[PDB]
Amino acid sequence: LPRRIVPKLATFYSANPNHEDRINRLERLLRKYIKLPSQNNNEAQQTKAPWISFDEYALIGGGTKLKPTQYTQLLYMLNKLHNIDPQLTNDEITSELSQYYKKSSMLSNNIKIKTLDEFGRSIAVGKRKSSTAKVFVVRGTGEILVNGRQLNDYFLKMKDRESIMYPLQVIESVGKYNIFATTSGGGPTGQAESIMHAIAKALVVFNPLLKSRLHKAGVLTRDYRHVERKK
Amino acid sequence: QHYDESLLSRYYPESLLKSIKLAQQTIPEDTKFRVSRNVEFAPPYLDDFTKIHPFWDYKPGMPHLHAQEENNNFSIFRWDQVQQPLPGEGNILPPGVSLPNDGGRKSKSADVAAGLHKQTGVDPDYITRKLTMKPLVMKRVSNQTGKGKIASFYALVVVGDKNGMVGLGEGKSREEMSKAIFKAHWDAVRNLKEIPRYENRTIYGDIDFRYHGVKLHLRSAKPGFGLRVNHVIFEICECAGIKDLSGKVYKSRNDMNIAKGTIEAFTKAQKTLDEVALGRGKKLVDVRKVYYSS
Amino acid sequence: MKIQTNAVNVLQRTSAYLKSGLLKETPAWYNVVASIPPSTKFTREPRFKNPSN
Amino acid sequence: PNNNDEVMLLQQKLLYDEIRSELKSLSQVPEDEILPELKKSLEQDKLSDKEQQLEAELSDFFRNYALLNKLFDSTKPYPNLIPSANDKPYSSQELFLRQLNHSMRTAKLGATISKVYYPHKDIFYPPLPENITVESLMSAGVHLGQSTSLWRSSTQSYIYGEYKGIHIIDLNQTLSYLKRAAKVVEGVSESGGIILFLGTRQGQKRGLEEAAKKTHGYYVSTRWIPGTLTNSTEISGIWEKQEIDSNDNPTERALSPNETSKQVKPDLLVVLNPTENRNALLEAIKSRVPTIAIIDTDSEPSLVTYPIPGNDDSLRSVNFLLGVLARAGQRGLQNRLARNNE
Numbered sequence: 001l002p003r004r005i006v007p008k009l010a011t012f013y014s015a016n017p018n019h020e021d022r023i024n025r026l027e028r029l030l031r032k033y034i035k036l037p038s039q040n041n042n043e044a045q046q047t048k049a050p051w052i053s054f055d056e057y058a059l060i061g062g063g064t065k066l067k068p069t070q071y072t073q074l075l076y077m078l079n080k081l082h083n084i085d086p087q088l089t090n091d092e093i094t095s096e097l098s099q100y101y102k103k104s105s106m107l108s109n110n111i112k113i114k115t116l117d118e119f120g121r122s123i124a125v126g127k128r129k130s131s132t133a134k135v136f137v138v139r140g141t142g143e144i145l146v147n148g149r150q151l152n153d154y155f156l157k158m159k160d161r162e163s164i165m166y167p168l169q170v171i172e173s174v175g176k177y178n179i180f181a182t183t184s185g186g187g188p189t190g191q192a193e194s195i196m197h198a199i200a201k202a203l204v205v206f207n208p209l210l211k212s213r214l215h216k217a218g219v220l221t222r223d224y225r226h227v228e229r230k231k
Numbered sequence: 232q233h234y235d236e237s238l239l240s241r242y243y244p245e246s247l248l249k250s251i252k253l254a255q256q257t258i259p260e261d262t263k264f265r266v267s268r269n270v271e272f273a274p275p276y277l278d279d280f281t282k283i284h285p286f287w288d289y290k291p292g293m294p295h296l297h298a299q300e301e302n303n304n305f306s307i308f309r310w311d312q313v314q315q316p317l318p319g320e321g322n323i324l325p326p327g328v329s330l331p332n333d334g335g336r337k338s339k340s341a342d343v344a345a346g347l348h349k350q351t352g353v354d355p356d357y358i359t360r361k362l363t364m365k366p367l368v369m370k371r372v373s374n375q376t377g378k379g380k381i382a383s384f385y386a387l388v389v390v391g392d393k394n395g396m397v398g399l400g401e402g403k404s405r406e407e408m409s410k411a412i413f414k415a416h417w418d419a420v421r422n423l424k425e426i427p428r429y430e431n432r433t434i435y436g437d438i439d440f441r442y443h444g445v446k447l448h449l450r451s452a453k454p455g456f457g458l459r460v461n462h463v464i465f466e467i468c469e470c471a472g473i474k475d476l477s478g479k480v481y482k483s484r485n486d487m488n489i490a491k492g493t494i495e496a497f498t499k500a501q502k503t504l505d506e507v508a509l510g511r512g513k514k515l516v517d518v519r520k521v522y523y524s525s
Numbered sequence: 526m527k528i529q530t531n532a533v534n535v536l537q538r539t540s541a542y543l544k545s546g547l548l549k550e551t552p553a554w555y556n557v558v559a560s561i562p563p564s565t566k567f568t569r570e571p572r573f574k575n576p577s578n
Numbered sequence: 579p580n581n582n583d584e585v586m587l588l589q590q591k592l593l594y595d596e597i598r599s600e601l602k603s604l605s606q607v608p609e610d611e612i613l614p615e616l617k618k619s620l621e622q623d624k625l626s627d628k629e630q631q632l633e634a635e636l637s638d639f640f641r642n643y644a645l646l647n648k649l650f651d652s653t654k655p656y657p658n659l660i661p662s663a664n665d666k667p668y669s670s671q672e673l674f675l676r677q678l679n680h681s682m683r684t685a686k687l688g689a690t691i692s693k694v695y696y697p698h699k700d701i702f703y704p705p706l707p708e709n710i711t712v713e714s715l716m717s718a719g720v721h722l723g724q725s726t727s728l729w730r731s732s733t734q735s736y737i738y739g740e741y742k743g744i745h746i747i748d749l750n751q752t753l754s755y756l757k758r759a760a761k762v763v764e765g766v767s768e769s770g771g772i773i774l775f776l777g778t779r780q781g782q783k784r785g786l787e788e789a790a791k792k793t794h795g796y797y798v799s800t801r802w803i804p805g806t807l808t809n810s811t812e813i814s815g816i817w818e819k820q821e822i823d824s825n826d827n828p829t830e831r832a833l834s835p836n837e838t839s840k841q842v843k844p845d846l847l848v849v850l851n852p853t854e855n856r857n858a859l860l861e862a863i864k865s866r867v868p869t870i871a872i873i874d875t876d877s878e879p880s881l882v883t884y885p886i887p888g889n890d891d892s893l894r895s896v897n898f899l900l901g902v903l904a905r906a907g908q909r910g911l912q913n914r915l916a917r918n919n920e
């Protein structure tokens with residue numbers, strides 16, 4: 001019957017009672033489920049780790065008192081519980097981990113699978129300096145047209161021609177596709193490399209397994225360099 | 232949804248019914264309204280827009296960019312008051328803030344009592360009603376810095392309830408002496424101690440105490456003797472509830488060190504008759520008190 | 526270090542706060558400490574025999 | 579005897595996997611292959627009285643539990659295990675569960691173990707203060723003081739002797755001091771006071787947390803912020819307080835901002851390593867908070883209300899003494915909750 005006022009958290013007298021209480025809750029789970037094996041897909045580097053930001057955790061983990069090393073300690077325990085084998089996990093672990101996932105999941109993604117159009121053509125756009133290129137890639141025999149003109153006519157420099165061919169040379173498919181490239185703006189180098197960038201982005205639809213090789217060759221990266229007004 | 236005139240005529244004013252009828256004849260019932268994610272035309276809340284809000288809408292009769300009255304038909308002829316008072320309660324006082332209607336009514340004792348109660352748990356009523364505060368030293372000290380001489384106010388005060396409890400407090404402030412006294416009063420309450428008193432009027436026997444350079448010689452006195460001691464000791468005795476005392480200060484007569492020495496002497500240099508009796512296993516009798524007993 | 530006095534006399538200092546009225550409410554430990562007095566002699570004790578031999 | 583019950587489910591579970599696998603097979607087939615041929619059959623078929631029964635029974639059955647239903651609302655262990663086929667070998671997860679079954683039943687066949695010390699049991703199964711012996715204290719290493727070169731002579735009265743270059747603490751006095759300290763913890767716990775357990779040496783957290791849990795108390799294992807008690811409003815005012823009944827259940831009453839800024843002072847402070855926590859001990863003195871601490875041969879006894887002479891460097895000795903104090907608190911808590919019931 002008699003009532004008294006007491007500190008809410010067992011860690012009240014510590015420097016950061018809120019962070020220590022949360023760490024204790026996670027530590028209990030890691031002790032109760034010490035035996036449960038961890039994922040063997042961790043070697044496969046599963047791409048899932050959407051934990052809240054240091055600033056977002058500061059709302060619940062002491063605010064100003066929160067130290068970066070304290071946030072690092074929270075992530076080491078959230079990941080360890082998360083990496084328990086999915087088949088052998090339980091509700092308790094997932095319930096505790098739910099509160100620490102980024103709330104961006106509230107909404108949805110903005111990416112729709114790219115597919116060939118009604119005529120079997122992969123359409124991609126590329127940009128370099130002030131130049132732009134819209135290419136139409138279809139399965140063919142290596143025919144290329146630039147703005148309706150022969151490649152040797154539009155691009156006089158052999159180095160520009162070699163730049164256009166490089167993405168097809170990486171996937172060793174130079175004679176497997178017909179390319180209809182349309183380009184505008186900038187000069188020969190910007191247009192040739194804008195076409196290079198657009199062909200690489202259009203080739204991924206035909207075989208998405210080759211994206212990693214295209215990325216490694218450097219043809220899927222948009223070159224950011226542009227003329228800078230002297231400051 | 233399209234509603235019959237009867238229903239709409241029981242909620243909306245007659246003047247607006249014609250507009251509702253024309254809108255229900257131009258917008259098909261199967262209209263699939265889309266939400267605009269570039270321009271926000273409507274407010275962030277629901278509103279039928281049938282009543283003019285005295286604050287959130289333009290004041291009727293006031294000139295402004297979208298005033299529909301002719302320039303010779305405005306109805307604001309007095310300009311001594313604010314035309315549109317704040318809506319609702321009439322204030323925007325932040326939650327947890329109080330309107331400063333009354334200023335200068337605070338009692339520094341009550342400010343000390345409230346702060347100490349929150350910080351240490353002492354009773355505010357005792358501090359504000361039972362304690363008496365007497366400043367003992369008030370001077371200005373200064374520190375020589377690269378920028379120049381930085382002055383500070385130093386205050387030493389003594390507090391007590393005149394019934395055994397006495398405390399000494401010190402305070403410093405670079406701003407004003409009143410702030411230094413507030414801190415000293417705050418410190419003094421935290422240092423409150425009980426001092427033994429023989430018959431609640433004097434000390435037990437005589438005391439020869441050395442506090443740094445101060446030599447204190449205090450002697451107990453008969454009832455009705457009064458306080459015959461250094462002025463600094465007098466104030467402390469008054470707060471503590473000592474009525475009869477004689478004494479002399481030798482060597483250093485620094486006021487600050489006399490006050491601290493006196494407080495220390497009253498606690499570390501006294502032994503009650505009860506404490507002496509228990510330690511020695513003997514009975515100690517006050518002959519003067521027995522002479523007037525039954 | 527000097528033999529400290531204020532750690533073992535918390536009960537007596539607290540009782541002065543309660544008697545005067547500076548502290549309104551008795552602390553929860555107050556009754557417990559009163560029933561179980563601390564040892565406050567802190568003396569050096571002689572010994573007249575080696576317990577081993 | 580009742581295995582068929584599970585077998586009936588597994589049968590359905592297998593059938594469900596078959597239905598799902600071939601639902602995905604038809605998700606790849608182009609519509610041009612199936613749709614026109616399917617529709618043509620209907621164009622060449624005539625519905626019968628029975629066929630029509632399902633023509634509307636399924637329409638409602640699909641217009642009731644698929645369209646006009648609430649998508650949301652306003653064998654339990656290891657429920658996500660994917661069992662392997664009866665012909666295939668055990669999966670890694672199944673082997674783990676197969677080993678866990680062995681661990682419970684067979685792994686402990688052959689002998690029992692007696693008179694062997696297990697470190698965890700000091701924390702989870704502490705003895706009662708009345709059952710503690712000198713032997714038990716000695717087994718935990720509580721008698722091993724500091725080097726005689728580091729002697730703080732104010733502990734002279736606690737020393738039993740010197741041996742192998744260290745001072746041996748008198749366990750007969752340790753036991754008497756331990757019993758007195760334990761009774762204080764029990765009293766404060768039974769009175770409803772706040773008990774704080776302070777220890778900042780590596781490894782002490784586990785003992786400190788369990789001691790706080792079983793006494794409904796508090797602990798600090800990382801760092802004592804200087805001023806936690808004397809400057810409490812600048813350090814601990816922001817943290818949340820709560821009101822509780824005599825059964826230690828949250829009343830749920832919202833607290834006025836006045837009640838949430840008031841200093842919440844511990845009723846009793848237990849310090850595992852006082853030599854490194856002078857700040858806390860001095861604040862306790864200033865705040866008139868009774869304190870208990872383990873006093874090693876190099877530690878000042880007079881700085882605490884109730885000293886416990888003993889080794890403060892060994893986690894076993896510390897956890898043994900902490901466990902005894904924690905269980906004493908637990909008994910006080912249990913006696914307070916019992917008097918409320920009756």
Ligand SMILES: [Mg+2]
Binds near residue numbers: 875890891
């Ligand atoms: Mg030690």
